[PDB]
Amino acid sequence: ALAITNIILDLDIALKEPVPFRRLHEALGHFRRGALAAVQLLFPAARVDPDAYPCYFFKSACPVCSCTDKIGLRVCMPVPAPYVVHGSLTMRGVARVIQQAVLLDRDFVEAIGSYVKNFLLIDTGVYAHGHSLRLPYFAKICGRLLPVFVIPPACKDVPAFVAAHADPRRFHFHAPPTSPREIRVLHSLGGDYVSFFERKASRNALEHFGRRETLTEVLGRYNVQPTVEGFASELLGRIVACIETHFPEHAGEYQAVSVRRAVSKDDWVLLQLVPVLQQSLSCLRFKHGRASRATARTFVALSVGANNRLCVSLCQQCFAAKCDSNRLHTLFTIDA
Amino acid sequence: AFLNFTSMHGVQPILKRIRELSQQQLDGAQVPHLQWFRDVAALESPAGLPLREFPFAVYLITGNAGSGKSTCVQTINEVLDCVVTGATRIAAQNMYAKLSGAFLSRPINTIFHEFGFRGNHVQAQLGQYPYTLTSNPASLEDLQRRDLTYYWEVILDLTKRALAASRNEFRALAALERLTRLAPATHGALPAFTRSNVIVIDEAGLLGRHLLTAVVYCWWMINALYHTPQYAARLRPVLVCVGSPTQTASLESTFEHQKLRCSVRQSENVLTYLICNRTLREYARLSYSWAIFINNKRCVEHEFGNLMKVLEYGLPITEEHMQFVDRFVVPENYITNPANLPGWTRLFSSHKEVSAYMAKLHAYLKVTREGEFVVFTLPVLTFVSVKEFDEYRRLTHQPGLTIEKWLTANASRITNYSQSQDQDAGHMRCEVHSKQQLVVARNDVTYVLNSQIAVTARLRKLVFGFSGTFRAEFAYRFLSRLIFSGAYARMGELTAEILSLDVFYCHYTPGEPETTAAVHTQFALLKRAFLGRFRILEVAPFSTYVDNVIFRGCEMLTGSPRQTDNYTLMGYTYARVFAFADELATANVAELLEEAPLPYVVLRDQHGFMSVVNTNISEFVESIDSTELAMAINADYGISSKLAMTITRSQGLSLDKVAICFTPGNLRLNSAYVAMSRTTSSEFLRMNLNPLRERHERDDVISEHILSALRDPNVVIVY
Amino acid sequence: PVEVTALYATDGCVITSSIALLTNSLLGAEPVYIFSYDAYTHDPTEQDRFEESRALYQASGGLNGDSFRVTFCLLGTERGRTRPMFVCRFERADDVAALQDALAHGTPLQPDHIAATLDAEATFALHANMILALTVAINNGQRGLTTLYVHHEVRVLAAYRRAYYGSAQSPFWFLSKFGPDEKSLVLTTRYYLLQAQRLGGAGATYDLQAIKDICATYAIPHAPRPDTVSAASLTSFAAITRFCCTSQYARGAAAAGFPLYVERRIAADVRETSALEKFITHDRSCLRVSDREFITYIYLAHFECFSPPRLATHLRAVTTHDPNPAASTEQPSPLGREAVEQFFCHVRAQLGEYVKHNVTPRETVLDGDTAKAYLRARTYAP
DNA sequence: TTTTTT
Ligand SMILES: Cc1nc(N(C)C(=O)Cc2ccc(-c3ccccn3)cc2)sc1S(N)(=O)=O
Ligand SMILES: [Zn+2]
């Protein structure tokens, strides 16, 4: 819900053998250079001088870096003014740009390359809603993230830079931005398939294999202008007929239910099937007790499949230990 | 015609590497001497066995099933010296089919036959002695000693049998002026390892790691006793291992002789051993010796191919993949119900599950009275002996054990496991007929009538006739026998030409001649005959056989008695033939087989020719006191329905239509990938649940190794 | 002195008949039938070779030499695709008259013509070592061959069938494994068996299917058959031999251009493929991308270079309409240049242009009190 | 759970 103001990257470095600190600090300077180039590329109307723009570095405790598993790093960058980044996917894209920009600078790969077993450094899955990231100045229940100072080459205030790593705002995703006239919100960077490889492969797929029409267009054939409950109505009868033949030990449970539209992806429409009031729908699989079984939710999933035919699936979400808790499972998919 | 192009031009670098790998001379001291294999025979236990390096080379040809790795093997065979082998008899026959479809390939046997595996080795204690590897880093000598200690009860017997056989052979010819190239031809029946150093093992992932060293070891054996010209040239074996590393696994079974608990653990296959061992990846230099075939040809679906890519390469499972595989999920009670998906092979993850489903299918096909498959009952017997189960009970430290409790688990270990534990059968009733000093047991196994069954073991087919439609030198004789059983005047106008009221139904002479010359004399005649009359006026089966048959019920009434091939079950004629009655222990049961008429089951091949086959007999010999003795011989039929099977066995052969029954909790993504990849088209695929949506134990360790191989400049990728 | 390499197959077991021929025994000797032959003279440019070969294979029919040393062979292995059995000189007028007749038409060579012309100085020398090995083995030239024939027949036949392993397979086998077309049946049988290893070159290491594909793209003009005999109307070797000998892919320009065209096609193909694989290997080695995007690149690149349409254009660019190398209609192939133009040069460039190509940015501008509003609303409180 | 070699 909130807007992200700091580029916080989790660098998980793999090691072939222990490393000297000086090599790590030089590699971090190269990383600063590459990341600042990537930032000045992503945010074109900003002014990132890559000799004074402060990047902040933290290393996990494992001098001799006694690292047998990994050099835990966290890199924090202020989002340059007047930009603010919005969206989990937008920061995912920022992370991919930074990651594929740091493995372009010859200095970084020359310095740390002989040590990193896998060149992947940045994890991009810590930006989804509800996913946690270990803050700096904190440990793990084995390594308290403590700052490693890579001073900008032309930093005009060293003491400020050092006493900038201790301010929580510098390492918080949705921190207060540190008299705003204009503000530019980067809220989308295309998506997962904007890579040239992805955009070329998708285009070749259409040329060689064929066009897979989108969900909306396919649904439009069956007089649905997204209304989806309109088709879900008639679909309920077929689904109930299927269950009261193949899954009969809970038959008289979905005789009277109302499709409740819950999730809407452009290729996945999930409508909940709550009845009329709190009588839960017994989980169709993994037979449980009287109360344990009646602790499940049911959904109907319309998608596009096969030779562009609308595929309707019955899905369940169970609150028991036997089934994956709060995970969506499928039971049957029927044609429409 | 353009399909072959990439393979044609990318196999050449492979060919231009195997040649130097095979023409690299070893130093004189590094060559394993004969005295080495003499000392191995002397050694009793595999503990004092000296650390001995056996040099070898490898070249790895890996890829998805449908990659085309077979084109590489084809090009290798016609250009290079090679001994083509196979990990399974089915794979060996598949390679023979695909090598004789281009040129001549000599009969392709299994690698086990090549290194001398015989009958008594089948049930041998292959995991007994221990080894604390003086390793990390593991020297190649230590790895080879581990693989020889693993197979001590096989390596020792092979060495003893080869050695104590005596010396002539090549030793003789080599001294022509003191011509070994012409030696394997003049002196025949010589082991095929004496004439080549390039050994191609196809589907080598079906072999455990213990075999790799073993093969190399055996190679040197057979080139030392015979003093082969390759041994004089100081050449070393190169093992071209062709197989899929992420669609194939090897399993080791050990039977505890008191608990009667046969256990099967997973093992490291040759491919995984070579890819994932730092010692072998350096000695064999897999970086400069690895070819990955990358293209899946039988995939006309983009999304299905993407799913195969993510599963094989270990890529992250995304929501889109879940939604795609969501369109295959059909209920548990829909797959298991025999009325649904007719003609679709059903895979389960348990042999008990298959035994349940086949019985249910038979119940359905009997109650609903389907004349398509008239379910029938056929006897299968077993023959235990009193002395065997007396002495073995004595040696197991427990002399109290019932015979039925003996057959509680050894029924699987008494014959081919696959069909033995995947068959619906009656209780193996036994009574004590000590006439030939035996305890006989007998039950019956229910099949279905007229189904595409497959032969499991090695059977001797005896073709009796041709049950094919009118469409259509000893084969020419059989065609003459067919003709021997061979508008109304207008097609008759051309029929009178055959003559030389149907004109063919006026006068005749015995259609099949006896001598070859007379057969050829009447051959061109009958060949032109059908072409002319049939042209004018083809669905009714032209049923013609050497002897009159009457299929009353299921048993036929042929009066006169005298594995890959997809046969069709027909019926159980008795018609005792001495051809199958090659019976010579074995004679004690031969007498009873004369007593009780052994039924010979009849099968119909792809062409339609009916063939009567022999039965199958298999021994159980395993013990704990190092006393391998012939306990029990199992006489049965050894046919498989090809309608239901296990996921693990599905790895071997591809299937047309597939419905997968997945047990939750036991979900392994490798099993899901293997099950889903047996069919070419994603259209004909149904599943119990979604393997991507359920909790699955993924083991992506070899996947990253292929990925790092796809990320190496010296690895040859062929598209 | 023109030297001919000839593949033959008698009516029945060719091994027994050939051995009886070598022993000068009139017991089993089916007239021999030659079906494929390569003629050469000890020596060249590509057009020099083409002129020499076009001179060798007389357009009217037969060869152009006066004396002929013919080395008959069988399908066997020593990896050589054939194996010689017996060598015959042809210097007399009657000898060459029989050879021209049997080489231009296909009429079988009677046992007399060969048997009176065995080069005993070399014929029995070819298999002399086999005689010695048989003597040594059975213990545990031509008189020796006869004696070993008498002593142990089974081992002699087994040795002459293990060596020359293929021997005679079947009349139908040749029509099966060497294409259904007459072009294949003549030209591919000549090259893959009697011309590949002798002339060396890359084609020595290419398989039968590859050579048949090369023959398929060797699309020289096709004149109709004077007798309109179809390639599938052949039953015995007397039909295959007659088809091949009176064919017009056997005694002239096409028979002279095929060996050179094999070399040309392979050279053009490897020029493009090797370039494409250099790019493939380099980009693969220096990609440094995520695992999924790596697989996407490797499959995308292999498609973008070796797709069915691109391949079809390339094979149409190497198809010939004439065997004369100086009058060839083959033209430069567009495979590698097109692949580099679209996918590879662009990927080398993206190797911060990558950001410009893959950014698709959406930055909404909010100026005024709405900026202050968006700040407090979507950022941790001050 | 788990096939395969004669
Ligand atoms: C438009 C297109 N068609 C493409 N073909 C022909 C293919 O993938 C063919 C294929 C498909 C699956 C596999 C496979 C096999 C085992 C495990 C994983 N995977 C291999 C090969 S690739 C593209 S692309 N790269 O442009 O989008
Ligand atoms: Zn549940």
Coordinates of C-alpha atoms in Angstrom, one line a residue, chain B residues 2 27 55 81 139 157 161 187 228 232 270 294 311 335 372 434 534 550 584 642 703:
Chain B
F2 CA 15.7 -30.2 -42.9
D27 CA 52.1 -45.2 -21.0
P55 CA 42.5 -46.0 -17.0
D81 CA 34.7 -48.5 -34.5
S139 CA 41.3 -40.6 -5.6
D157 CA 33.1 -64.6 -10.3
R161 CA 35.4 -67.7 -14.7
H187 CA 38.4 -67.3 -34.3
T228 CA 44.3 -58.0 -27.9
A232 CA 49.4 -54.1 -27.5
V270 CA 26.5 -43.6 -14.3
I294 CA 18.7 -29.7 -26.5
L311 CA 10.9 -29.1 -14.9
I335 CA -9.0 -42.1 -13.5
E372 CA -14.3 -56.4 -27.0
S434 CA 7.0 -85.1 -3.7
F534 CA -8.7 -57.0 -55.5
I550 CA -11.2 -73.1 -33.8
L584 CA 16.2 -80.9 -20.3
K642 CA 0.6 -52.0 -21.2
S703 CA 19.7 -29.8 -12.8

